[PDB]
Amino acid sequence: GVQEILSRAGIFQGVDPTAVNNLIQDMETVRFPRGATIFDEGEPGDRLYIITSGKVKLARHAPDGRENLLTIMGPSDMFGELSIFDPGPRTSSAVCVTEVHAATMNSDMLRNWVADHPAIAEQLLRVLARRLRRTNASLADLIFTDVPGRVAKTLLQLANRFGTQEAGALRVNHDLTQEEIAQLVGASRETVNKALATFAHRGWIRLEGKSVLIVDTEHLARRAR
Amino acid sequence: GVQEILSRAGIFQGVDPTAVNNLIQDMETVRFPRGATIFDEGEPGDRLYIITSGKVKLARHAPDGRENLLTIMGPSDMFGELSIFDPGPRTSSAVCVTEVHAATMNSDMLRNWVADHPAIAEQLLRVLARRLRRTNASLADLIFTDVPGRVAKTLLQLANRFGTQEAGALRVNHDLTQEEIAQLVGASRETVNKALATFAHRGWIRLEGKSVLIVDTEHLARRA
Ligand SMILES: Nc1ncnc2c1ncn2[C@@H]1O[C@@H]2COP(=O)(O)O[C@H]2[C@H]1O
Numbered sequence: 001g002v003q004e005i006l007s008r009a010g011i012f013q014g015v016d017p018t019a020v021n022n023l024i025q026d027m028e029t030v031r032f033p034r035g036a037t038i039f040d041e042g043e044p045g046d047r048l049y050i051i052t053s054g055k056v057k058l059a060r061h062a063p064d065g066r067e068n069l070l071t072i073m074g075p076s077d078m079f080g081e082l083s084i085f086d087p088g089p090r091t092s093s094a095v096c097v098t099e100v101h102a103a104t105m106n107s108d109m110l111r112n113w114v115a116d117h118p119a120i121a122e123q124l125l126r127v128l129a130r131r132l133r134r135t136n137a138s139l140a141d142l143i144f145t146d147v148p149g150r151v152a153k154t155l156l157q158l159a160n161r162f163g164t165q166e167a168g169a170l171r172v173n174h175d176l177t178q179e180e181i182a183q184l185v186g187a188s189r190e191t192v193n194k195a196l197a198t199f200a201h202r203g204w205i206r207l208e209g210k211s212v213l214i215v216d217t218e219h220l221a222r223r224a225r
Numbered sequence: 226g227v228q229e230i231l232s233r234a235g236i237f238q239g240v241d242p243t244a245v246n247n248l249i250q251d252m253e254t255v256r257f258p259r260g261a262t263i264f265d266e267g268e269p270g271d272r273l274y275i276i277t278s279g280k281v282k283l284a285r286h287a288p289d290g291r292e293n294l295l296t297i298m299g300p301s302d303m304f305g306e307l308s309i310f311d312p313g314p315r316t317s318s319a320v321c322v323t324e325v326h327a328a329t330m331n332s333d334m335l336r337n338w339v340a341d342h343p344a345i346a347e348q349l350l351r352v353l354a355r356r357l358r359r360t361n362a363s364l365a366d367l368i369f370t371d372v373p374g375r376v377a378k379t380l381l382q383l384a385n386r387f388g389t390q391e392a393g394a395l396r397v398n399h400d401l402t403q404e405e406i407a408q409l410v411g412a413s414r415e416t417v418n419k420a421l422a423t424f425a426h427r428g429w430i431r432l433e434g435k436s437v438l439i440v441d442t443e444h445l446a447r448r449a
């Protein structure tokens with residue numbers, strides 16, 4: 001239910017359960033339709049969001065119109081915190097990939113919570129560190145891996161985040177377009193298409209809409225690195 | 226003369242000088258010779274560092290052995306926090322470019338600090354948040370900036386960090402080998418040498434061993 005999903009967000013881990021239930025209760029429930037923009041990169045804001053259902057992509061923009069997708073968040077994930085702790089523009093656009101349900105609060109509310117519960121501040125440090133940890137790997141990936149290996153990685157990352165076991169395989173209803181997968185990878189639409197085709201062609205994965213079955217993890221794993 | 230250099234670290238910014246002064250004194254010092262590894266990528270860490278003197282490069286490693294440098298840290302810079310707040314292995318090596326002196330603390334001392342002083346907590350959050358903002362930009366530069374644009378950016382970052390006025394021009398004693406420079410930029414030595422020679426052929430920059438003089442910053446800044 002909504003309170004169990006919210007209770008799993010990093011920001012509440014090990015924190016007093018009671019304080020958690022009460023804090024959840026002062027959060028606002030919102031719902032966005034698919035494709036809605038929650039905020040744009042460069043906007044100022046200090047609202048924070050914790051998703052309870054659906055997927056939100058976080059997009060950054062190059063002067064020439066193009067975009068890379070930093071990541072795709074889903075239920076229990078948090079975004080919006082960064083502008084609070086380092087005041088400044090949104091470091092990306094948050095856009096609903098599906099219909100999205102989230103809990104949200106302003107930064108006054110968050111600050112008061114932290115003042116009542118220092119453990120929150122500690123969990124927030126773990127959250128930003130873990131994000132530096134992941135993003136550093138993405139950067140390494142751009143420096144050291146070829147496009148096909150990067151595509152492979154991206155897919156295994158989607159599988160770990162959103163994958164279901166389905167008749168021996170990983171069902172990954174990622175809901176992304178072809179171009180968006182590419183933006184997630186940080187490479188051209190053609191190369192990324194090429195690699196994807198290759199991987200289907202070998203039987204490693206199976207395309208089927210904005211969804212992928214991943215049937216030999218290890219082969220795809222071998223190909224990344 | 227360690228106290229003042231340390232008080233210039235991000236973790237203490239705006240924090241009370243006497244609370245800063247008191248906290249500095251629980252920090253434990255270490256010294257390393259030139260070329261030493263303080264710690265390796267994948268090592269489990271428990272220790273935080275703030276450099277008081279000299280330079281540290283933070284490197285990542287591909288299985289086939291090649292290296293990339295995330296950044297170069299000097300006096301006042303803080304590293305090793307990531308493993309403390311997200312327990313897990315080191316996200317890079319730390320290697321001594323020059324002889325390095327540093328103040329350190331382990332994770333139990335830092336948790337105390339974070340739990341006892343909201344302002345230090347706040348500062349740390351600000352430090353990680355700003356590192357995210359910066360890394361995002363690096364990652365975008367890889368995808369969208371041309372190689373010589375990156376060199377230009379890497380030079381000015383070095384100048385922004387270690388630049389000292391000289392002859393109306395910026396003197397930048399970075400202490401790096403061309404390979405290291407290339408590895409900071411994160412591109413083939415061929416491309417990074419060729420872009421360095423160009424800016425020279427002009428007169429934006431002059432090479433000298435492991436030191437650069439940036440004469441006209443304006444145009445270098447422009448080239449980013
Ligand atoms: N590299 C990243 N990895 C994961 N999340 C990020 C990353 N960069 C930014 N974000 C999230 O994207 C949000 C965009 O708005 P803020 O900058 O307010 O806060 C940002 C973070 O919550």
Ligand SMILES: Nc1ncnc2c1ncn2[C@@H]1O[C@@H]2COP(=O)(O)O[C@H]2[C@H]1O
Nearest residue numbers: 283304305306307308315316317356360
């Ligand atoms: N993107 C980054 N920007 C600045 N410093 C970093 C970055 N990534 C890692 N580091 C520093 O390098 C240190 C390596 O050890 P830790 O992972 O514990 O902590 C890391 C950070 O202190």
